[PDB]
RNA sequence: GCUUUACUGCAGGCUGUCGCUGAGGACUCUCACUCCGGGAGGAGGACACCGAUAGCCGGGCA
RNA sequence: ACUCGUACGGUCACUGAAUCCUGCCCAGUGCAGGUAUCUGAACACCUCGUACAAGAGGACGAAGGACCUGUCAACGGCGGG
RNA sequence: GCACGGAGGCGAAGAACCAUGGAUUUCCGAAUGAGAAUCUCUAACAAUUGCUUCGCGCAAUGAGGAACCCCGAGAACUGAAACAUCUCAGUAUCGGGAGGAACAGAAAACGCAAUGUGAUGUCGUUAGUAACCGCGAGUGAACGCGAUACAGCCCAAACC
């Protein structure tokens, strides 16, 4: 909430997760806030996800600005466990990063676009 | 020395407590949603041990039986109203805003909904003077002009039992009985009649305070006795 | 007074202890009940 | 590259600036309505907790504790004392608030043992600290190579005997040389002059 | 043991200052915090309460 | 605690039923109010000093005091010539 | 049995006695289903916790112990020929807690200043020295050295 500067439509969040799900089956993805953070730092990330139900918020407060000064696009997910499921986890995930998509570059592209527009 | 009586009081031991287990009830106004659709019938007049004044037992429409702070002139059978739309007559309760200026009131709330704080003693009454949209000006029994939120509820009329103070107790025994119904240690032994160890005024060949009685507001408990922060004393001047 | 069942058991025990040292103990030890109590001269517990 | 953890750390170097400032302003409102000791599922300062020994494992518990701010709360002398032992107002206690907090937490969880604790802020009238406690009887811990040490009998009630990091510092045991003449090996053995 | 304008201190009260504490020498606001209200909501408001410190008073106490 | 209390209350003191009365004194002390000017601490601020700090000085000045006023059914006083 | 009686009994089916192990082990008692001056009333880990199959299912705590030990609270008589800083003294006493011993402990050390020592207790000494102090009365270390015993390791993070 303090790190969320815009609301994402339930339908946009739908496409993103699906894309992330196919991204793990095809391309490569990072699960976890630490791995996600390094991806953004190493610049090896195309799209990063950040749950909105993270408590304490400290764990993810840095993703937004870290991504901006790294050009990496990011999107918000409402549920923490959905991101973990979509990422192919038996648990939850506060943040995620699609390290090079996989047969979803067209979608990941559109998603990043629909966001920039959504400001 | 030893702690003075005023300090013994604060510990709240039996000797200084009020016979609460004997008290009837706290005459706080009823809580109404709105509409004023609340009316009851005076079912009986009773004695209130804690105030030496009468109180009225009321049965409300919705089945609630409660004692109420009774104004003068309220009798069994009479119908009382409590709400914004209540009628303007003795025994009824409604916010100051709905009350017409120049009408004597009692059991006035300090903060809207508290149940009444001002003018609750025998034969007293506050006088609603000025109205407004932001402030209701009331003249309390002490003569002080109090600014109240127009939303503060009150009861029309003066408190029952007036004149109670006009007759002397005549004898100690009567004071005694009254005191047994209050949170007060009585009778009273003068400070000057005690030993130096017991009070700032104790000691000395003959009785007399060995000091001026007007004491500073800043004096600590144990020393704050006599005439507290008096702006003046005596009758002259 | 009103004694409880337990108080009664204790009182009973004290009464029992108030007996004499059997005569045979005398012969055997070849020569006093130091805890001899009197209802009046003494005071029991409780 | 920088760990995500370093970001939590860096935020907490200035709890009064940035987003952290707003989080605290919001949080404390809720904290002020909670009890003296509240168990929490996750540390508010992850980096600090893991740094102190915390692990996301069975038998590891975290609880936030609040304590009234200020100096000592002492009763003035009823019997005669010389000016020196008449002091009442400016005299403070010998245990810091963090230590008091660690003990309350441990009393709440009689079966757990204090591992460490850290500050999570304060307002004008109270201070908050989170405490990491461990279940010495849970096998997930009896088998942990990094925590099984706290299962030993001599580790029972360690916080009440000053065996905590906060305990050791408060006992003036930080320095190994100058200044620790009367603190090591114990305050008591040195006649209580440290 | 008791007294006081004995000595020296200690509670306590008043007062300034710093923290709690925010936004736009006099001011507005609301979001902390306080109070009233069963609740909605109302009143107050960066004050007050509380922590720290400074000056004054200080046989109430040692 | 007072307090299921709210100035026709209850707290703190003095005098001590009724009756007839209760004079003069506010300089000292006490309490309270006011206060142009004077005095009045710490933090912040300014000058000097220190590559910093100790420290010296300055400006501002709250309560309090100086000063003024009210007050004796307030402590008390009501003499010598 | 102490305990030297009377009566009677047990023991070669090896008693008594002793060692080890086991059985029985009323009620109150931390005392734990609720209550109670050792008893009573109608199935019990009461209470706080952890795990959890979310069910008291599996577990922990509670109280004791001569002192010793660790962490907190902390006097006064007394000395100074009075007394306030100081002293008595971090003593007496109080609160909490562990063990068979505690505590300490592998340097952001030491600073015989070095081309030197090398975790920590403790003992001897260093020394009534340095330092404190109405610079009064009094208080009072450390490094080092000689001994005792010796022992060094594990995380957090980086990268996965
Ligand atoms: Cl009266
Ligand atoms: Cl512990
Ligand atoms: Cl050396
Ligand atoms: K002394
Ligand atoms: Mg009432
Ligand atoms: Mg009485
Ligand atoms: Mg009298
Ligand atoms: Mg007398
Ligand atoms: Mg006195
Ligand atoms: Mg007299
Ligand atoms: Mg007289
Ligand atoms: Mg018999
Ligand atoms: Mg030792
Ligand atoms: Mg309230
Ligand atoms: Mg004295
Ligand atoms: Mg008389
Ligand atoms: Mg039982
Ligand atoms: Mg002496
Ligand atoms: Mg001398
Ligand atoms: Mg000493
Ligand atoms: Mg040294
Ligand atoms: Mg390892
Ligand atoms: Na007897
Ligand atoms: Na514990
Ligand atoms: Na005496
Ligand atoms: Na005068
Ligand atoms: Na047995
Ligand atoms: Na148990
Ligand atoms: Na259970
Ligand atoms: Na002497
Ligand atoms: Na003497
Ligand atoms: Na001295
Ligand atoms: Na040498
Ligand atoms: Sr989870
Ligand atoms: Sr009331
Ligand atoms: Sr009420
Ligand atoms: Sr006197
Ligand atoms: Sr007069
Ligand atoms: Sr007798
Ligand atoms: Sr224990
Ligand atoms: Sr008279
Ligand atoms: Sr005067
Ligand atoms: Sr060695």
UniProtKB/Swiss-Prot annotation, chain A:
Pfam families per the UniProt record, alphabetical: Ribosomal_L7Ae
Localisation per UniProt entry: Cytoplasm
Organism superkingdom: Archaea
Keyword Ribonucleoprotein: yes
One Gene Ontology biological process: ribosome biogenesis
Entry's Gene Ontology cellular component terms: cytoplasm; ribonucleoprotein complex; ribosome
SUPFAM superfamilies in UniProt: L30e-like (SSF55315)
Keywords attached to this entry: Cytoplasm, Ribonucleoprotein, Ribosomal protein, RNA-binding, rRNA-binding, tRNA processing
InterPro entries with a match to the protein in the record: eL8/uL1-like, Ribosomal_eL30-like_sf, Ribosomal_eL8-like_CS, Ribosomal_eL8/eL30/eS12/Gad45, Ribosomal_eL8/Nhp2, Ribosomal_eL8_arc
UniProt key word Ribonucleoprotein: yes
Assembly and oligomerization: Part of the 50S ribosomal subunit. Interacts with protein L15e. Probably part of the RNase P complex.
Listed PANTHER family: RIBOSOMAL PROTEIN L7AE FAMILY MEMBER
Family: Belongs to the eukaryotic ribosomal protein eL8 family.
Function: Multifunctional RNA-binding protein that recognizes the K-turn motif in ribosomal RNA, the RNA component of RNase P, box H/ACA, box C/D and box C'/D' sRNAs.
NCBIfam families the record matches: eL8_ribo (TIGR03677)
Name under which the protein is recorded: Large ribosomal subunit protein eL8
Lineage, uppermost ranks: Archaea, Methanobacteriati, Methanobacteriota, Stenosarchaea group, Halobacteria
UniProtKB/Swiss-Prot annotation, chain B:
Cited SUPFAM superfamilies: Nucleic acid-binding proteins (SSF50249), Translation proteins SH3-like domain (SSF50104)
Gene it is expressed from: rpl2
Name recorded for this polypeptide: Large ribosomal subunit protein uL2
Highest taxon, organism lineage: Archaea
HAMAP family on file: Ribosomal_uL2_A
Record keywords: Ribonucleoprotein, Ribosomal protein, RNA-binding, rRNA-binding
Record flagged with keyword Transport: no
GO molecular function, one term: rRNA binding
One cellular component term from this protein's GO annotations in UniProt: cytosolic large ribosomal subunit
Assigned protein family: Belongs to the universal ribosomal protein uL2 family.
PANTHER family xref list: LARGE RIBOSOMAL SUBUNIT PROTEIN UL2, RIBOSOMAL PROTEIN L2
SMART domains referenced in this protein's UniProt entry, alphabetically: Ribosomal_L2, Ribosomal_L2_C
Role description: One of the primary rRNA binding proteins. Required for association of the 30S and 50S subunits to form the 70S ribosome, for tRNA binding and peptide bond formation. It has been suggested to have peptidyltransferase activity; this is somewhat controversial. Makes several contacts with the 16S rRNA in the 70S ribosome.
One of the protein's GO biological processes: cytoplasmic translation
InterPro entries: NA-bd_OB-fold (IPR012340), Rib_uL2_dom2 (IPR014722), Ribosomal_uL2 (IPR002171), Ribosomal_uL2_arc_euk (IPR023672), Ribosomal_uL2_C (IPR022669), Ribosomal_uL2_CS (IPR022671), Ribosomal_uL2_dom3 (IPR014726), Ribosomal_uL2_RNA-bd_dom (IPR022666)
Region annotated Disordered, chain positions: 199-237
UniProt subunit comment: Part of the 50S ribosomal subunit. Forms a bridge to the 30S subunit in the 70S ribosome. Interacts weakly with protein L37Ae.
Keyword Ribosomal protein tagged: yes
Additional remark text: This protein can be partially incorporated into E.coli polysomes in vivo, indicating it can replace the endogenous protein.
UniProtKB/Swiss-Prot annotation, chain C:
Top-rank taxon, per record: Archaea
Gene Ontology terms for molecular function: rRNA binding; structural constituent of ribosome
SUPFAM superfamilies on file: Ribosomal protein L39e
Xref: PROSITE patterns: RIBOSOMAL_L39E
InterPro entries reported for this sequence: Ribosomal_eL39 (IPR000077), Ribosomal_eL39_CS (IPR020083), Ribosomal_eL39_dom_sf (IPR023626)
Record bears the keyword RNA-binding: yes
Signal peptide (residue range): none
CC terms in the record's Gene Ontology section: ribonucleoprotein complex; ribosome
UniProt keywords, alphabetically: Ribonucleoprotein, Ribosomal protein, RNA-binding, rRNA-binding
One record GO biological process: translation
Family: Belongs to the eukaryotic ribosomal protein eL39 family.
Free-text function comment from the UniProt entry: Binds to the 23S rRNA. Forms part of the polypeptide exit tunnel.
Assembly with partners or alone: Part of the 50S ribosomal subunit. Interacts weakly with protein L23.
Name under which the protein is recorded: Large ribosomal subunit protein eL39
Gene name linked to the record: rpl39e
């Amino acid at each position: 909430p303090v790190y969320v500067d815009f609301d994402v439509p339930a339908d946009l969040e739908d496409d993103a997760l699906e894309a992330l799900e196919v991204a793990r089956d095809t391309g490569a993805v990072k699960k976890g806030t630490n791995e996600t953070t390094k991806s953004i730092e190493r610049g090896s990330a195309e799209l990063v996800f950040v749950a909105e139900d993270v408590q304490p918020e400290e764990i993810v407060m840095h993703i937004p600005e870290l991504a901006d000064e790294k050009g990496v696009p990011f999107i918000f997910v409402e549920q923490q466990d959905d991101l973990g499921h979509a990422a192919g986890l038996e648990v939850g995930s506060a943040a995620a990063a699609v390290t090079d998509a996989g047969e979803a570059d067209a979608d990941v592209e559109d998603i990043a676009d629909k966001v920039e527009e959504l400001r | 020395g030893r702690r003075i009586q005023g300090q013994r009081r604060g510990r709240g031991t039996s000797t200084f407590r009020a016979p609460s287990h004997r008290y009837k009830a706290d005459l706080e106004h009823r809580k109404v949603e709105d509409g004023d659709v609340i009316a009851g019938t005076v079912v009986d007049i009773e004695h209130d041990p804690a105030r030496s004044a009468p109180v009225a037992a009321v049965e409300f429409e919705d089945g609630d039986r409660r004692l109420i702070l009774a104004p003068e002139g309220v009798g069994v059978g009479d119908e009382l109203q409590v709400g914004v739309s209540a009628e303007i007559a003795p025994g009824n309760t409604l916010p100051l805003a709905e009350i017409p200026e120049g009408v004597p009131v009692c059991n006035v709330e300090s903060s809207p909904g508290d149940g009444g704080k001002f003018a609750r003693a025998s034969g007293v009454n506050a006088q609603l003077l000025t109205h407004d949209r932001n402030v209701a000006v009331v003249k309390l029994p002490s003569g002080e002009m109090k600014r109240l939120d127009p939303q503060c509820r009150a009861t029309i009329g003066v408190v029952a039992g007036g004149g109670r103070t006009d007759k002397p107790f005549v004898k100690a025994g009567n004071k005694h009985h009254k005191m047994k119904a209050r949170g007060t240690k009585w009778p009273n032994v003068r400070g000057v009649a005690m030993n130096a160890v017991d009070h700032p005024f104790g000691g000395g060949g003959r009785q007399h305070p060995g000091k001026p009685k007007s004491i500073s507001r800043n004096a600590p408990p144990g020393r704050k006795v006599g005439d507290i922060a008096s702006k003046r004393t005596g009758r002259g001047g | 007074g009103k004694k409880s069942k337990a108080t009664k058991k204790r009182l009973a025990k004290l009464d029992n202890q108030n007996s004499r040292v059997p005569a045979w103990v005398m012969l055997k030890t070849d020569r006093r009940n130091h805890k001899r109590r009197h209802w009046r001269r003494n005071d029991t517990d409780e | 590259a920088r760990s995500a953890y370093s970001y939590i750390r860096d935020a907490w170097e200035n709890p009064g600036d940035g987003q952290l400032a707003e989080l605290q302003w919001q949080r404390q409102q809720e904290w002020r309505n909670e009890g003296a000791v509240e168990r929490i599922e996750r540390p508010t300062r992850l980096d600090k907790a893991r740094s102190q020994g915390y692990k996301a494992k069975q038998g590891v518990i975290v609880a936030r504790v609040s304590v009234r701010k200020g100096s000592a709360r002492k009763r003035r002398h009823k019997a005669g004392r010389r000016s020196k032992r008449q002091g009442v107002t400016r005299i403070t206690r010998r245990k810091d608030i963090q230590r008091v907090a660690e003990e309350r937490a441990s009393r709440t969880f009689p079966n757990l043992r204090v591992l460490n604790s850290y500050s999570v802020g304060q307002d004008g009238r109270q201070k908050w600290h989170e405490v990491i406690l461990i279940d010495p009887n849970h096998p997930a811990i009896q088998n942990d190579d990094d925590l099984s040490w706290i299962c030993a009998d001599d580790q029972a009630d360690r916080v009440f005997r000053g065996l905590t990091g906060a305990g050791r510092r408060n006992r003036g045991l930080s320095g190994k040389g100058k200044g620790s003449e009367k603190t090591r090996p114990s305050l008591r053995s040195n006649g209580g002059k440290a």
